[PDB]
Structures are given as structure tokens and as C-alpha cells.
Design a protein around this ligand. Structure first.
Ligand SMILES: Nc1ncnc2c1ncn2[C@@H]1O[C@H](COP(=O)(O)OP(=O)(O)OP(=O)(O)O)[C@@H](O)[C@H]1O
Ligand SMILES: Nc1ncnc2c1ncn2[C@@H]1O[C@H](COP(=O)(O)OP(=O)(O)OP(=O)(O)O)[C@@H](O)[C@H]1O
Ligand SMILES: [Mg+2]
Ligand SMILES: [Mg+2]
Lengths: 293, 293
């Protein structure tokens, strides 16, 4: 099947809320790509926006290159680089949990990606293990972690004047409840701190194998987000992070306490993870759990 | 990491009961392979047997080539061709069910693989969607279905004299309860008919999205296999296959009724599936659900 004049559609490799992702090849150079098909419907995310965002982030480390955007009948297509499995997929292959070393090494890369996005005056707003993918097996970047899916990004400040957006409330709950920040549950405008908090939730998820608020009770959607939000507030950080390196508690504590328009101290955060590795008497290498027997 | 003198171990791609499968490359020719690591322990399946079986089936269509078998410290390794995702994985990408066309086309290939194994005087005994994989994306055999994992094969007849094995009982339950034949639950020696029945269970699983005996009640292992076995016996075929082409009921009916040492009429079975395609006014092509938007 051929789309975008010179891209041959292969088999499905992923599925989302409204879109299907296929692996394919650019017929002019035989390069492998991923094609995201999005149905043009009222309740679907505008793929052109994701395209714009990819262009705006072109060149940043860990961000895939975008090649084509266009309409194919009743769908909008986005052609980007073909990447490997997500960290969620990798979990399934490693006993549903990652060791401290893997989490610290992964955290450093993930945190760097989020910083790149923030420096472009954007907040990601959809932090989840599913959106972080590693490179292709036989590639130089086989162990590099990338970020895909920019469907929910938003500008937290004017790019030119750096004037931060005002604090607002009544916001409608968007992304993944399991990882969202407490402020998000509370219907507050999301900023840099929220991305960092959600990232901390993912880190703890990796270490423990699960979060205290996963799979609750016979409730409805609005009840789900709420019961989860309440459980997050009632769960003490010392408890959430008990048994793991102190730096994890410190990360959670920092993220949770940042002010709405505060500029994160990314260097401090990166340092926490480097400390974790030091204590383990290990370095930041490529020995992730998924490359180990 | 290098094993078997010239095979470089990459990342994990699969996991089983005792073994871990990694993707890798043969350093002499840069060919991609899959390396199966098996811990040398009392309760683990002898990988040398799987090796022997691969050799015995060398050359058969849909059977991957074996390259190396050996010990690497506390593990036994088996190097075979690198294949694509399993049909179980593909299900996840297609809404947890396959259309009639995909099932009929898939059935023809799967049935051909089982026949090849039977013709070599062996019964597979581990029929499940997880053991049927398609080829690699950019390959001529991208849409060919293969069979891997020969850990439970057994000779049902002497290869030279073709003298069939006697009927025995008290057999201990082995493989996947969800797909096994009723005779298997009953602790009876498995033969060709059982492989065919389990294959029918998989076909119905594909079509319906689930089987009537999936996820039962708070029971134990021996209770699980039993409750499942009882549910299989209490579930009428007309009921199991209701709503789908008559040929599916006919396949189930044939498989269920074969005698212990009966030689299946593979041609008759293949014909049923061809009829299904004819009625759909379609042919056996490569338009599986996973290649379709
Ligand atoms: N570039 C890519 N290379 C390889 N796999 C990819 C690529 N892009 C996406 N995937 C896979 O496809 C899945 C879904 O992609 P994506 O998140 O863009 O779909 P979506 O409909 O926007 O998702 P959702 O709404 O579920 O977050 C990813 O989670 C991942 O498993
Ligand atoms: N040759 C291969 N190429 C690609 N993927 C493969 C290959 N062999 C196996 N796999 C993947 O790895 C998974 C497990 O493999 P395998 O079934 O051989 O392990 P096992 O320990 O014998 O399994 P189990 O006991 O779970 O059946 C497969 O189900 C499939 O997902
Ligand atoms: Mg996603
Ligand atoms: Mg298996």
C-alpha cells in the first residue's frame, strides 16, 4: 500500500486511542519509517499539531525526525523514524520491574528529553512509559531512549518573551490517571513541575512494579480519576519510596514542591541519579536489564 | 556479549517458562538470529532435544533454521533464525480478534505446518498462538507463518515401521489448558487428533476473541485444568461455533471425532478453509488484518 507518494505501508506495530501506527519504508531510499494514521474526526487529536511540534523540536537529541504529513482519504498521516519497543513493552520482558541501575540510567535520559521540550517553551502533559521508546536493535542508537507522541503538548510560556502562562483551574482531566500529578487531578493548569512529578511516578512504577493507586474499586471514569487522586494524596512519599535509594524520595519531594511557574533545577535532578549510580559503584553504560540474561 | 564463538547477543525479545530469547547477529556474516538461553536445571526442558528436532525438520516450509547448540556456563543456547511477532502479539494490535478471512488464510498455513511435523512421525503437543510467528517485516517471507518451540514434541509412531504408539492413560497434564484437547484433560496419550483439536480451539479463540472456559473461578492448578476440561465437555460445538462459517463447526467436529491412531485427512481440512475463502469471494492473499488499516 503506498501513501505520501513514496512511502510503502507495511504491518501494524502500534495502536493508540484513535490512531494506528505501521512500519513502512521510504521507496526513494529504502529507509525504514513509522506511519501514524489518524482518523479525521471531531474527538480526535489534530495530527497537524503533532507535526508542527516535531518540526519545532527537530534536531533535539532523542526526538525522532519527521518526514511527511498529509491526508490520505479519511485519515491524516505522519511519517517519522521507525523506533524500537517502549519501556512499557520492555517491562513485560524483564519481570514487570526494573532494577535500580536501569532506572537511574533510564531516568537520566528521560529527564534530558523532558528538559529539551521545556526549553522549547512546551510542557509534554502525557508522561507514560508507553511514550518512551528505545532505538532499533541493530543501530548505533539501540540503547538511546526517545520520546514520541506530542499530541498533548502546550506552550507554558511565550517563546519570545518567556512570559509564563497564568495559573488557571477548572481544567478538564486529560492523560493517564496512573501517572498524572496531584495538581492535575485537582483540575489545575499544568506546568513544568507536573511533567517532572509524572516522571517521578513512572520511576517509582518501574522500581516497585506497581503503584499503590493501580486498580481500585467499582467506580466510573470521573470516579476513577478522583479515587486515584485521593489515594495519591493519602499516600506518603516516605512510604511510596521506602526501600529504594534516598535520591528517589528526594526527586519526588522536589517535584511535588515546585511552584507553578518555577524553573526546575534540572542539574540538581540529574545529579541525584548520578549519585545513585556512584553508590552502586557502577557507571552510566548500556547494561540495561533488557540486554542482560 | 558473545556466545557460540561468533554470535553477538543483543536485547531480549521473548521470555518463556524457563528460557529467555534474545535477538543477535552472526558475526561472520552479519545475519540476524535469535538465541534461546535455557538454564540447566532439573525441571527445565532439555534444549538438546529441541535442537535434534530442528535438525530432523530442517528444510520443511515454515520451520526456522537452526545454527548452533551449546553450553554457555550455566545455560544451554540454541541459535535459530530471527522471526517476527507471534499471532498472540498480532491479536493485541487487531482488537483482540481476527476476521474470518484472516483466520481462514492463517489456518491453511498453520495446518500445513502441523502436517509437516506429523509426516516426520511427531506430535507437537504445545499448540498455542504464541508458538506461531510471522516473518520479519522487510523480508520475502514477511507474511509466512512459522512454528517455533519444539520442547514437547514426541514420536507417535516408529519412523521406519510406522508402527503407532499404544494407547495409554494416567498421563500427566502438560501444555496450555486453554487450548488442549478434551482427551488431554482426561490424561490420555496424545496423538495427531489432539494437535488438530487444539488447533481448532485456537481458531475459535481467534474468531470469538475468547473461549467459554477462559478465566474460571477460585480454584487451584489441578482444579483449573479440571474445571476447564469439564467446561469443554459441557460446551456444545454448535454453540462454540455459532455465528461463523459452517466449516469451522465441521473442522471441530472432525478433529473431535478422530480415532486415537487415525491418519487425518489433511486435504479435506484444507478444503474447508478454501471453501470459506471462496464464499467470501476472496482468495488466499497477504491481506491479513495486521496489514490493514
Ligand atoms: N516511531 C515509532 N516507532 C516505533 N513504534 C512506535 C513509533 N511511534 C509509535 N510507536 C508505537 O505505537 C504506539 C502508539 O503510538 P501513539 O502513542 O503515537 O498513538 P496514539 O493514538 O497517539 O496513542 P495514545 O493515544 O494511546 O497515547 C506507541 O505507544 C508505540 O508502541
Ligand atoms: N525465533 C524467534 N524469533 C523471534 N521471536 C521468537 C523466536 N523464538 C521465540 N520467540 C519469542 O519468544 C517467546 C518464547 O519463546 P519459547 O516459546 O521458545 O520460550 P520457552 O521458554 O520455550 O516458552 P514457553 O515455555 O513459554 O512456551 C516466543 O513465544 C516468541 O514471543
Ligand atoms: Mg501512546
Ligand atoms: Mg512459548
Amino acid at each position: 500500500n503506498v501513501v505520501g507518494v513514496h512511502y510503502k505501508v507495511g504491518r501494524r506495530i502500534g495502536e493508540g486511542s484513535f490512531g494506528v501506527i505501521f512500519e513502512g519504508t521510504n521507496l526513494l531510499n529504502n529507509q525504514q519509517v513509522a506511519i501514524k494514521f489518524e482518523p479525521r474526526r471531531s474527538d480526535a487529536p489534530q495530527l497537524r499539531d503533532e507535526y508542527r511540534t516535531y518540526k519545532l523540536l527537530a534536531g533535539c537529541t532523542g526526538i525522532p525526525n519527521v518526514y511527511y504529513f498529509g491526508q490520505e482519504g479519511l485519515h491524516n498521516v505522519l511519517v517519522i523514524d521507525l523506533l524500537g519497543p517502549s519501556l512499557e513493552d520492555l517491562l513485560d520482558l524483564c519481570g514487570r520491574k526494573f532494577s535500580v541501575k536501569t532506572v537511574a540510567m533510564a531516568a537520566k535520559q528521560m529527564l534530558a528529553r523532558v528538559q529539551s521540550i521545556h526549553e522549547k517553551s512546551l510542557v509534554y502533559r502525557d508522561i507514560k512509559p508507553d511514550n518512551f521508546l528505545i532505538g532499533r536493535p541493530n543501530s548505533k542508537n539501540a540503547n538511546m531512549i526517545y520520546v514520541v507522541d506530542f499530541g498533548m503538548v502546550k506552550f507554558y510560556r511565550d517563546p519570545v518573551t518567556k512570559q509564563h502562562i497564568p495559573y488557571r483551574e477548572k481544567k478538564n482531566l486529560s492523560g493517564t490517571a496512573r501517572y498524572m500529578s496531584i495538581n492535575t487531578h485537582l483540575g489545575r493548569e499544568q506546568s513544568r513541575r507536573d511533567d517532572l512529578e509524572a516522571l517521578g511516578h513512572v520511576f517509582m512504577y518501574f522500581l516497585r512494579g506497581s503503584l499503590p493507586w493501580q486498580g481500585l474499586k467499582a467506580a466510573t471514569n470521573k470516579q476513577k480519576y478522583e479515587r486515584i487522586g485521593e489515594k495519591k494524596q493519602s499516600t506518603p512519599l516516605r512510604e511510596l519510596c521506602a526501600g529504594f535509594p534516598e535520591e528517589f524520595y528526594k526527586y519526588m519531594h522536589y517535584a511535588r514542591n515546585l511552584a507553578f511557574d518555577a524553573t526546575p533545577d534540572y542539574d540538581y535532578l540529574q545529579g541525584l541519579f548520578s549519585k545513585v549510580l556512584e553508590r552502586l559503584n557502577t557507571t552510566e553504560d548500556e547494561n540495561f536489564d533488557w540486554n542482560l540474561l
